[PDB]
From Swiss-Prot, chain D:
Annotated glycosylation sites: N93, N117, N153
Domain of life from the UniProt record: Viruses
This protein's name: Spike protein S2'
Residues of the full protein shown: 964 to 1120 of 1255
Outcome of mutating E36G: In strain: Isolate Shanghai LY
Physiological role: Acts as a viral fusion peptide which is unmasked following S2 cleavage occurring upon virus endocytosis.
Amino acid sequence: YICGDSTECANLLLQYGSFCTQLNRALSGIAAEQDRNTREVFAQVKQM
Amino acid sequence: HTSSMRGVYYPDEIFRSDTLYLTQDLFLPFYSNVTGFHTGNPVIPFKDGIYFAATEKSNVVRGWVFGSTMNNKSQSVIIINNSTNVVIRACNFEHTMIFDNAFNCTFEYISDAKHLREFVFKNKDGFLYVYKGYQPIDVVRDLPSGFNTLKPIFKLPLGINITNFRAILTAFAAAYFVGYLKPTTFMLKYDENGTITDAVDCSQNPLAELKCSVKSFEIDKGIYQTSNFRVVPSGDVVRFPNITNLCPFGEVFNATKFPSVYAWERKKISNCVADYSVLYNSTFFSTFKCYGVSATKLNDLCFSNVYADSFVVKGDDVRQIAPGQTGVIADYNYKLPDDFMGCVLAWNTRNIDATSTGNYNYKYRYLRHGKLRPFERDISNVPFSPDGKPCTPPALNCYWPLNDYGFYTTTGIGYQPYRVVVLSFELLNAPATVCGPKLSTDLIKNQCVNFNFNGLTGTGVLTPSSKRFQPFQQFGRDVSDFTDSVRDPKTSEILDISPCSFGGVSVITPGTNASSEVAVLYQDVNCTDVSTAIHADQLTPAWRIYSTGNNVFQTQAGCLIGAEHVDTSYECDIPIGAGICASYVAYTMSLGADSSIAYSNNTIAIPTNFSISITTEVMPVSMAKTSVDCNMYICGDSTECANLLLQYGSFCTQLNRALSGIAAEQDRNTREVFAQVKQMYKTPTLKYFGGFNFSQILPDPLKPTKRSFIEDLLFNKVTLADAGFMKQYGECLICAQKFNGLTVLPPLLTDDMIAAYTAALVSGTATAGWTFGAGAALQIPFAMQMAYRFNGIGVTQNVLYENQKQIANQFNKAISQIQESLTTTSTALGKLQDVVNQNAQALNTLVKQLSSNFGAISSVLNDILSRLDKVEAEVQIDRLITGRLQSLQTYVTQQLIRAAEIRASANLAATKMSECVLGQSKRVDFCGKGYHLMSFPQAAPHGVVFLHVTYVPSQERNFTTAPAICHEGKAYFPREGVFVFNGTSWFITQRNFFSPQIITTDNTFVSGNCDVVIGIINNTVY
Amino acid sequence: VKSFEIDKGIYQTSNFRVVPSGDVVRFPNITNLCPFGEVFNATKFPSVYAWERKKISNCVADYSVLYNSTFFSTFKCYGVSATKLNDLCFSNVYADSFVVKGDDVRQIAPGQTGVIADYNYKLPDDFMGCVLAWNTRNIDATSTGNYNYKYRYLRHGKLRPFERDISNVPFSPDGKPCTPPALNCYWPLNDYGFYTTTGIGYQPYRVVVLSFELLNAPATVCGPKLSTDLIKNQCVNFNFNGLTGTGVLTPSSKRFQPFQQFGRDVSDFTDSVRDPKTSEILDISPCSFGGVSVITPGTNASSEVAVLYQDVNCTDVSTAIHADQLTPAWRIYSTGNNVFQTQAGCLIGAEHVDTSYECDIPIGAGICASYVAYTMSLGADSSIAYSNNTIAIPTNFSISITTEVMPVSMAKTSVDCNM
Amino acid sequence: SRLDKVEAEVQIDRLITGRLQSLQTYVTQQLIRAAEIRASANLAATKMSECVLGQSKRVDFCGKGYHLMSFPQAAPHGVVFLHVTYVPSQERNFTTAPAICHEGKAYFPREGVFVFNGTSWFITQRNFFSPQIITTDNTFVSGNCDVVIGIINNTVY
């Protein structure tokens, strides 16, 4: 989403910081949070 | 030969404390193919960068030869020790070997003036690095590999040359190990006393990339998302058009004459192949100003129908031929556009176009009503008047619209005639006309390839398209404006799928104590692309030690590598999005077993007995009160940088008010949770009521501690799982101080005060009645409380009478099982561990992005201040500020959202305390598992742990029903005695467990109808 | 907070610093004059394919000679601005001697592909010192010619940074070693062509390249700054041979001896140093810092105020105020007593009332203020013990009415985002 | 007016970008304010439907004690409720009487929360008072006599 598949631009992002790591951890944290949502809603049953 | 497995370079020359440190420029990958010479013949080993081991007792063999292209053709670094006085020369050619010839010699002489030696030699940017280290290994034992018992320390750099040749000067064990090195990265363990003792190599194992990622050696199990992959393109595709000929440029730049500027000429250049290298290396040209392109990478870039404009100007108007740049001539003669631009070429003609007597064959227009439009051409010669009204000269204020230039050879530099040709480029309107020399390579379908089309550069996979785009040129785009498809100049139209593929990998472990076996999750692929790319060695994060036995491609999560479809379903340890879970190995489903319960028309299930359970509850009520000095996290203690922040705005004031607002919000959270009590009560000093202990719930007054035994088990369980790295947060607990302006304030309520409210609530609950909001004390026998909670369920007080010792024993066994189930477990009290982990990761992320560059020089202020100017350096300092403003503001935002969620669960804790503790919450499954019946609060680090003490009826008997008992006109209804026990309509019982009753009138109820129901019931004697 | 009437409460306002009192400068021991006039006034320089590397170390320079000298024509510095070069010590600097044409002077730079820089003297990208060049149209060029200065112009591939190519073998573009006069087989050298009759761009420029390599060893070259004495345990300034800062130096219990002079953080700040006068010592972080707070009874009770310094010892603060070194220090200010309890380091303007109260104003350790500060607020005691035959049952009651305040809406705002 | 049309824009880009950051920060923080006011607004919509339109049985949600009534009142950007609660505040310190056995059988009060043990005189519920005759309709029958520690005799229903 930044730089596409350029090499030099990706080198500039490597000079920028750990920003992509923050975005993947936060957005993945939302991604697991959705599964906790659906599991806490439906999966309450002892026995089908 | 001998693939060894260690070699730990010292990357820096700086102490680090007990930490873990990732490092970019390291070498010697683990388990690499190491050759040896267990014979010895030193004839041709190559040096790219080397790692040596010497296996001689007391180090006889010690000679070193380095260079390139031997036998009197290049210099050579030689290292030979001379009785512990190391002789190092760097100019010899081909002991006695250095004295053969020293023909063209200049160099840097340096003299230092069981058993196992070891060396790391590395060329670096024109100067060579030497490390060395040794081990007292049993030397007869061949192939030792040195299992991380080695730390080669920095020895010697020097600046000479390329090395491409290596030899050893011996005294001819005779085994001598040589290993290459390879640039990746890896992670170093750093200990007390500056030692290493361990190091994880990255890029050899997905487990090892996980260890390089989440900064540990012990790693819990779970889906861990880490760095994404690419499929590296294998083939190149270049598709410039068909035609080829030489180009009419020397016709223009070597032309016989150019006209004036009001009659500038437009020459069209098309259907050609140019080079443009003639225009580069030519100081014959004086002015070469290119705007739209940099024109040096112009060669692989084809245009459509380029143009040229010929005119001749004075040098002072050369700065007027530019976008913008108003001027006079550019207003009146040749108006330059703003954006669409090629190049401007000008060169001097003081030999031909100007004589020392004059040459006025070159005129200019200088009068016009209004400016010109871009590439507007004005030709007409009519005399001027400023208000319409056509003159006739010599009428007054009526000039001619032209003048002469005035070039003499006697004049200086600024009055020299400059010829100007303007290249004008117009871009992708047609098939490509002009090109640089690049052969149109062949086309490859369905492979990860490179795009070099006449106006396109990219990377994709080309498929034949089913599409009709023929009147539309060569480029067919997206909503996001990326080219969906093309038209070939060799007449074809073809899509490209998007890139080849991509996606973030994931790592599945059983958790570093079960095994080191790992399963890798490639997310959004086909597994044809991936098994292709790995089995062609084209995948980007590909590891050294890696294989592929089986492969799972199921509905998502494209290449799951390292599992087997177990058709037996399990209880879903680790989740993967398609419904697929993993353990131990992956499988499809987890839903619990079957149950086949069908109602037959006369069927009740009613128990005979029950049990009492106690469940725990874990809720966060507070996060850590943090704060930021927003004038040392930016700029540190510089003065000039702080002046730039004063020019920036009121940003630090916003951050302190917002973050302090969170800080008070935490105290409102903890106060709203615990401080609900009208009146603190002492512990009753019995800790037994109706038999059963209340011990270990209330604090022990004999042993000098403030917190109860459950509570100390909780503080120890979170304390053993705290991410207590004291330096990163930097609090006072005697104090402790940290450099980066970043503090943690303590909570208002002390831990002993929290335990004081907790003991007040429990000790109040055991005595004093469940009434607390309405008088706060009513002094009840505790058995009578349990009778009234039993009354709150709907259970008869007989059940508290009769089975009282059974209730006491289930209570005490229950609380003992709570003590064991909180003693040595994982994932219980998981949430409170997760709060500390998340705030720890946020602060560590802020601190690491303090040390990150943003500009061009360094990440360290008070360093580029001394390195540089006061005025010129500030363009770096503004970048270092703005990056820290973004990284700081992000932290303020995300902790504000954390404060929102902890605020929400804190209000569930304030509600859940007022409901469950201070009364019997009738409503179903809010407080506990079953019928609620009691609870107790317990303090916890930044949290509350409840103990819900619920009634669970668990027995079954399968009776027949009895709704409506009619005899004569009238039917009788039980109305509270939930069913009439139909053991042929014998009794009356309520739906909790039992205690049947006589069928009598006071237990029943009267209606005057007999016959609507399907219930055929007679035979009562009340 | 922009008022004259102010309600009571902990009001956080602007932070403090402890201004450093003493300076510490610790450049190394050795001192001598420097071999620069040997180079910039030298008898001859060689060509560019045989550029020379002269090592400069264990010296004390000035660099003010190179500033005020229009004798030099070209002075291009990249890694440093070179004007503040004087108080900055390096380790083992280098010099490179060669002589070029003026049009190749713009090729001696990081980046800047050129032809000669591809073939003779490849410049690195990042690690860089300075480039000095000056004109020699009086000696190194005659009006009849002087072709003692050649250049290499043919090579299979670019050079690496500071790669040195010497060997003289005739060229062929596909391996296959020639023997002249075979066709398309040149020599790998050519001549320059400086005449005194030529203009400006054909004048011989001598170039010495300063190359700096940075903190790999103890400092070798320095500018004249006397190594001042060392002060322990005080808010002082760092001027070490590669370091500038502000801290408080403590003796360390540490074993860092094979590791050079600088011992860093996770956040990459220097935890400790090795002195060139052989000692190793930590510094605590800065001297101190933290945001102050202000405690008022609320502008109608009084104008008496109590100040809350957060993260200090109160030895540092009472020291710094009684040495007049604290940064936001006010004109009319005194210090009667002092409270240092468990946090909130210097609470100035209160007395520990051992009588506990109902906690008007909160301070994080459990400490509350009013009216004056104190330790606790929990409500009174109650001793209610169950005896085996005990009920508490009322006789009468009351009816109360309490209020409840809840927000349901904020203000509907909007922004024209084009004005 | 002070400067160029072309050269001044390198200043104007900075003045834009700062205003973009400062404006976007305002949009974010008021979005979070809207989240919190949304949350307490749903506590107001729930608390109105609970406390006003019925008697909320659940403890200390609506008011201080036993809830008994409420009333809404409008307020600037807010709601002020008036909870009208019952608070029992007197005390007398009696003796207990769990289980009254005479001959084989013990009798339980079952709603008349305690047997008033002024030597086992009456039957009263735990709100404030109104004791009752010990009679059978106020009591309940079980056929066991002896598990409890409660030694209680002398009824005349």
